Amino acid sequence: AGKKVLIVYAHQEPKSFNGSLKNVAVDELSRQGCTVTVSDLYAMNFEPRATDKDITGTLSNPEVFNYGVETHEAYKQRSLASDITDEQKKVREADLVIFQFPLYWFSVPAILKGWMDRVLCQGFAFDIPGFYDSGLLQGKLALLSVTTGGTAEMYTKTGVNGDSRYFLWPLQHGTLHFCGFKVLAPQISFAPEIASEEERKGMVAAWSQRLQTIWKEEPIPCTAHWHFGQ
Amino acid sequence: AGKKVLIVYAHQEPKSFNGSLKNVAVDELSRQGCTVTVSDLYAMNFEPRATDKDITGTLSNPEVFNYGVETHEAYKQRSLASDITDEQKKVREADLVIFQFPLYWFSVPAILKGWMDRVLCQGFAFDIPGFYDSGLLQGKLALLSVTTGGTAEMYTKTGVNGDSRYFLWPLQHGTLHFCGFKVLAPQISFAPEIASEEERKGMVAAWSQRLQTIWKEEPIPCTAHWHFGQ
Numbered sequence: 001a002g003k004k005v006l007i008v009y010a011h012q013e014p015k016s017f018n019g020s021l022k023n024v025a026v027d028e029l030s031r032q033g034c035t036v037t038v039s040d041l042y043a044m045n046f047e048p049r050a051t052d053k054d055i056t057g058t059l060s061n062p063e064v065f066n067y068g069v070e071t072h073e074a075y076k077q078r079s080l081a082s083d084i085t086d087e088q089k090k091v092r093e094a095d096l097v098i099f100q101f102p103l104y105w106f107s108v109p110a111i112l113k114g115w116m117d118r119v120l121c122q123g124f125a126f127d128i129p130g131f132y133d134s135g136l137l138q139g140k141l142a143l144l145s146v147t148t149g150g151t152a153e154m155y156t157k158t159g160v161n162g163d164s165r166y167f168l169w170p171l172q173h174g175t176l177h178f179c180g181f182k183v184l185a186p187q188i189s190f191a192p193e194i195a196s197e198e199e200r201k202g203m204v205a206a207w208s209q210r211l212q213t214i215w216k217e218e219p220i221p222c223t224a225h226w227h228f229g230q
Numbered sequence: 231a232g233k234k235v236l237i238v239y240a241h242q243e244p245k246s247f248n249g250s251l252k253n254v255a256v257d258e259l260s261r262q263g264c265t266v267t268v269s270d271l272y273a274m275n276f277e278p279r280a281t282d283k284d285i286t287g288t289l290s291n292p293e294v295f296n297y298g299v300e301t302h303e304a305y306k307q308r309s310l311a312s313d314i315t316d317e318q319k320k321v322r323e324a325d326l327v328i329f330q331f332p333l334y335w336f337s338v339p340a341i342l343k344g345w346m347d348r349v350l351c352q353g354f355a356f357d358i359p360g361f362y363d364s365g366l367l368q369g370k371l372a373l374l375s376v377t378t379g380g381t382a383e384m385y386t387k388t389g390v391n392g393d394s395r396y397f398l399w400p401l402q403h404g405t406l407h408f409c410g411f412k413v414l415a416p417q418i419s420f421a422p423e424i425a426s427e428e429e430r431k432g433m434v435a436a437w438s439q440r441l442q443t444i445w446k447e448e449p450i451p452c453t454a455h456w457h458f459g460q
């Protein structure tokens with residue numbers, strides 16, 4: 001060994017700027033000798049809803065359904081639906097998880113929100129006492145690669161949309177950090193669509209360039225102060 | 231006369247704490263003589279995924295699928311999927327929209343994130359320009375009614391999960407304010423699974439009692455400072 005990378009990718013269109021950034025991630029990490037896996041959520045028609053279908057066979061209480069409880073129990077009893085256990089297997093084996101998505105409403109698209117809701121269950125991603133620093137996925141790196149509609153000016157502390165780190169908190173701290181990940185600095189590709197075919201190629205290339213030294217990188221301190229303070 | 235209310239409700243179990251909060255809201259608004267509609271997302275089997283199935287007419291650009299561009303043009307042409315347009319009709323008629331959901335990863339369950347992704351499209355909820363204070367849904371009130379797993383103390387600036395207002399940002403500001411809603415103070419029912427019987431009953435009745443005077447409330451100043459202080 002050797003390192004393993006999972007790219008969780010959430011875009012409808014392979015020719016898109018998200019497609020290109022995913023293809024460049026695959027090419028470059030593959031070049032370096034890395035083991036690479038991609039979850040293309042839309043091509044998988046990945047199920048985003050948290051429902052009782054997520055548990056196979058019979059339920060620990062079919063009278064009052066409690067998703068958190070029943071999925072925890074199904075995880076321990078190897079009874080989670082196979083789309084979920086497949087995703088968990090890829091996360092278990094990965095040293096680095098990259099999420100590649102367009103910003104939808106200051107967050108992840110719903111299909112990707114559902115991956116997080118469904119795959120990162122109690123028992124697998126976290127437990128009492130295994131959370132934040134002690135989360136079950138400790139030692140793994142996570143990285144957000146996000147494209148925006150709005151320009152970098154719009155995302156400053158006194159722009160319309162506030163500081164980028166404001167929306168990153170629920171994903172980076174609330175989700176990734178809670179599960180044990182060390183979170184690398186986000187990669188935000190601002191406003192690809194109102195940009196020349198040449199600021200674009202430079203955005204794709206700095207992503208490609210950045211992946212070259214990805215393993216030497218230091219994890220951000222994932223704190224309230226990092227996201228909000230000075 | 232004569233207010234209209236929409237409750238967008240995202241929970242699997244009618245007998246849950248969310249279910250109760252939703253029932254008391256129906257009962258209380260109904261008692262006041264308000265017109266009440268409930269979108270029960272899980273029971274509608276609501277589609278969270280933003281796909282090309284959401285447009286039924288000729289695509290603007292059939293070679294490269296762009297979801298934001300296609301749904302904007304489908305909106306103006308009236309070729310959006312009818313599940314989207316049924317929701318837009320409920321929103322259009324409403325004076326107040328209440329979101330009732332359990333916090334999933336510092337945000338909304340994916341089914342409800344899909345509601346926001348698919349229903350609040352360009353042309354309907356905002357335009358460029360015509361957002362934030364100029365958003366197209368100006369005039370309407372919005373309220374988040376959220377239940378948590380973590381306690382109020384968790385949930386504080388010096389607690390593990392940070393201040394509760396940190397995770398409201400993408401939802402209150404990035405989504406609702408952007409579309410032009412005035413945002414009412416969120417209702418957060420902290421840690422109902424941990425609470426005693428009387429503490430739960432008191433939480434239900436606090437919601438009930440708040441709704442009695444709901445139309446006399448001023449919105450919050452929905453800004454970086456309200457969310458983040460400092």
Ligand SMILES: Cc1cc2nc3c(=O)[nH]c(=O)nc-3n(C[C@H](O)[C@H](O)[C@H](O)COP(=O)(O)OP(=O)(O)OC[C@H]3O[C@@H](n4cnc5c(N)ncnc54)[C@H](O)[C@@H]3O)c2cc1C
Binds near residue numbers: 019346347
């Ligand atoms: C429901 C919804 C909610 C949204 N919410 C927000 C929000 O909160 N905040 C916000 O800022 N935005 C938001 N947006 C806008 C969204 O984030 C952007 O539309 C998106 O990030 C653009 O990424 P893309 O890959 O789809 O762009 P694309 O349109 O696919 O890419 C831009 C251009 O680059 C070209 N291209 C493809 N590959 C390459 C490459 N090899 N090199 C050079 N050019 C290439 C493409 O052909 C295209 O012309 C939202 C959009 C939707 C639909």
Ligand SMILES: Cc1cc2nc3c(=O)[nH]c(=O)nc-3n(C[C@H](O)[C@H](O)[C@H](O)COP(=O)(O)OP(=O)(O)OC[C@H]3O[C@@H](n4cnc5c(N)ncnc54)[C@H](O)[C@@H]3O)c2cc1C
Binds near residue numbers: 334
């Ligand atoms: C995928 C996922 C992600 C999550 N992420 C987070 C997170 O990021 N942060 C966080 O804090 N939490 C998180 N949670 C926890 C979640 O927010 C809570 O479990 C949820 O808010 C609890 O609400 P509920 O309606 O399901 O409670 P229930 O378990 O249904 O309610 C608790 C008790 O109240 C009882 N009850 C129902 N109605 C009444 C009434 N009329 N009067 C008195 N008692 C009543 C119920 O019968 C039950 O016994 C997550 C959970 C999941 C499954």
Ligand SMILES: COc1cc2c(cc1OC)-c1cc3cc(O)ccc3n1C2=O
Binds near residue numbers: 161301
């Ligand atoms: C500049 O900051 C934003 C840009 C955009 C949106 C939201 C933003 O701040 C909350 C947004 C929602 C949205 C929804 C669609 O269906 C299509 C495009 C969208 N869009 C953007 O370009």
Ligand SMILES: COc1cc2c(cc1OC)-c1cc3cc(O)ccc3n1C2=O
Binds near residue numbers: 067120336
């Ligand atoms: C106290 O703060 C949290 C509580 C909980 C979660 C995340 C939290 O902080 C980010 C969370 C994720 C989660 C996922 C499941 O499948 C079932 C239960 C869950 N759970 C909680 O109780």
Ligand SMILES: [Zn+2]
Binds near residue numbers: 174178224
């Ligand atoms: Zn953190």
Ligand SMILES: [Zn+2]
Binds near residue numbers: 402404
């Ligand atoms: Zn605001």
